[PDB]
């Protein structure tokens, strides 16, 4: 309502419109290549900025600050795992996807294994995973942020947000979102650093955070409800391993073996196997540029500890009776959620700490985060649907029809997400960010398993790869179904779920499920008749440098020696900095 906020939001919209108009004037959106793969013309800084911006949504502010508030700094693990896995994208996965000549990741499996059915299976599974693990988090965390910071209607505001991002997505191709993602990455980091600064000033520096956080308990630990009573000292007190990434392998909330192995498997899928991230790398002008983009994205994937997780911990320190409330009556009075109020951590810092001018900037940050993630999901899902499902139903379709079907799919997935908004608003508190990481850990590891076996084990054939994916979903669904049955509850009200099904951390189930899907794929592969070498040139990590005539069931990825040498040294320096920071907070 102060004019400075409205001018900052209009200035942000003018930046995004301006870069969109410039990209549309520059690039060709008349062809499938241009609109879905940016012309394969995207140099390193759009690729890095877009990898970052496609990933960091409103979920990262609300979820990582919230979980920061609730559980301390191990949740940085989600982000910091990414750092290692992006080097598997640029150096292992991205080269093979450039030599395969693929527009989609289901198409890669079509070329590698050769059935009609692995491509269709994976497209449909990918579309569900984007409704459940990507669109859900953006709608939900957007709606949290609006409820707390703005106070507007959390239906109408989400319809408006989903509708503006619809236009932003359909209007330009992959070249408009990736240039716009360079501005959105600048706004996200810029405004998020300014909030980090205000937060750290309020606790009295970095020393302030680490001497006040373990003391930051609520004073209201007695419920008016009988059979709740005096709340346990275990839940309202901060965890005494709050300052440690590497938490106890059986009793830790994020066990360290589960963080390192189990997140690498789920991050495997998310960064190396999944249309949303990999489209950014299928649009790079060459492999050196993809690799350089993968370095930038890695350094940006450090920033979320300092910009989201530690600010959420400062919110617990500053507003302990509101962010760290345990009494259901008090939590229902504070944010409307009986199971806790972690999720208000990030949007209370914006309300309480930001002056007249910068509240607007932090609204622009959440909008930049929300729009970049939602647009990237809509565009990738548009590509999946168009180029895998619609080219099945119409093979002789052609590049004008496929762009129209592409643009109408964005309208349909927006309408599906409006339909889905009440089911995601049924998630009560910080439960949702556990559900998304649980669903990612039950559906993604069989896909991680087939992509690693597709890329490194040429014996693995179509029967193996398909029956591994279906075996994989059967095991994943055993966990997912019985769980969601028993609910979550809270630490105050624990669920009646049987220890067996869920004592085991969901990221540990990721490791089991990966090796079981991989084992089933290898076993059914080794039983059934193999795929020979004439079917496999430039589709496997071995044969990415082949030049031989493939028989089907940009091809040249050799880069300048000097620029190769530069990006290879920068991958090693970025891993040293990663490893130092994991040691520092271990």
């Amino acid at each position: 309502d102060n004019p400075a906020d409205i001018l900052v939001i209009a200035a942000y919209f003018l930046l995004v419109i301006g870069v969109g108009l410039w990209s549309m004037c520059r690039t060709n959106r008349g062809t499938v290549g241009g609109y879905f793969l940016a012309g394969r013309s995207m140099v390193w800084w759009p690729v890095g900025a877009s990898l970052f911006a496609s990933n960091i949504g409103s979920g990262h502010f609300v979820g990582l600050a919230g979980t920061g508030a609730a559980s301390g700094l191990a949740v940085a693990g989600f982000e910091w795992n990414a750092l290692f896995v992006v080097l598997l994208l640029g150096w292992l996965f991205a080269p093979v996807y450039l030599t395969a000549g693929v527009i989609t990741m289901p198409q890669y499996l079509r070329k590698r294994f050769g059935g009609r059915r692995i491509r269709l299976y994976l497209s449909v599974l990918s579309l569900f995973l984007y409704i459940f693990t990507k669109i859900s988090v953006d709608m939900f965390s957007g709606a949290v942020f609006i409820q707390q910071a703005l106070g507007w209607n959390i239906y109408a505001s989400v319809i408006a947000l989903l509708g503006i991002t619809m236009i932003y997505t359909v209007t330009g191709g992959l070249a408009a979102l990736m240039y716009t993602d360079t501005v959105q990455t600048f706004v996200i980091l810029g405004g998020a650093c300014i909030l980090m600064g205000y937060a750290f000033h309020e606790v009295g520096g970095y020393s302030g955070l680490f001497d006040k956080y373990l003391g930051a308990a609520t004073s209201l630990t007695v419920s008016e409800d009988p059979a709740v009573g005096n709340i346990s000292s275990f839940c309202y007190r901060p965890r005494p391993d709050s300052y440690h990434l590497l938490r106890h392998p059986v009793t830790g909330d994020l066990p360290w073996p589960a963080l390192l192995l189990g997140l690498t498997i789920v991050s495997g899928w998310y960064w190396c196997s999944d249309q949303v991230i990999v489209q950014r790398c299928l649009a790079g002008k060459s492999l050196t540029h993809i690799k350089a983009g993968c370095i930038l994205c890695g350094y940006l994937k450090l920033t979320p500890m300092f910009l989201m997780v530690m600010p959420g911990m400062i919110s617990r320190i500053l507003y302990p009776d509101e962010v760290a409330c345990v009494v259901p009556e008090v939590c229902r009075r504070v944010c409307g959620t009986e199971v806790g109020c972690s999720n208000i951590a990030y949007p209370r810092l914006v309300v309480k700490l930001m002056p007249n001018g910068l509240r607007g900037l932090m609204l622009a940050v959440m909008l930049a985060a929300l729009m970049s993630s939602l647009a990237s999901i809509f565009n990738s899902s548009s590509t999946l649907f168009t180029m895998d499902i619609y080219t099945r139903l119409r093979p002789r379709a052609g590049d004008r029809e496929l762009l129209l079907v592409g643009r109408l799919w964005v309208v349909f997935i927006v309408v599906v997400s409006v339909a889905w908004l009440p089911v995601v608003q049924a998630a009560q508190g910080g439960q949702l960010f556990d559900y998304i990481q649980a669903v990612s850990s039950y559906l993604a590891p069989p896909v991680s398993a087939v992509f690693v076996l597709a890329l490194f084990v040429p014996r693995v054939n179509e029967q193996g790869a398909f029956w591994g994916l279906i075996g994989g979903l059967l095991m994943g669904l055993a966990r997912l179904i019985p769980e969601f049955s028993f609910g979550s509850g809270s630490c105050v009200q624990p669920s009646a779920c049987p220890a067996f099904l869920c004592g085991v951390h969901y990221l540990y189930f990721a490791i089991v499920l990966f090796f079981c899907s991989g084992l089933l794929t290898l076993t059914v592969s080794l039983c059934t008749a193999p795929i020979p070498r004439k079917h496999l040139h430039r589709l496997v990590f071995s044969l990415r440098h082949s030049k031989e005539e493939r028989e089907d069931l940009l091809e040249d990825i050799s880069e300048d020696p000097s620029w190769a040498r530069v990006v290879n040294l920068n991958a090693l320096l970025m891993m040293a900095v990663a490893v130092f920071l994991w040691g520092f907070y271990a």
Partner: peptide
């Protein structure tokens, strides 16, 4: 000390990458 854990972590990582250059140099060529 956090700083010693950081430096020790980096030192172990530089040992592993030195091993990776050793193994591919002697066992791929």
């Amino acid at each position: 000390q956090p700083w010693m854990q950081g430096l020790i972590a980096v030192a172990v990582f530089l040992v592993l990458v030195a091993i990776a250059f050793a193994v591919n140099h002697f066992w791929c060529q």
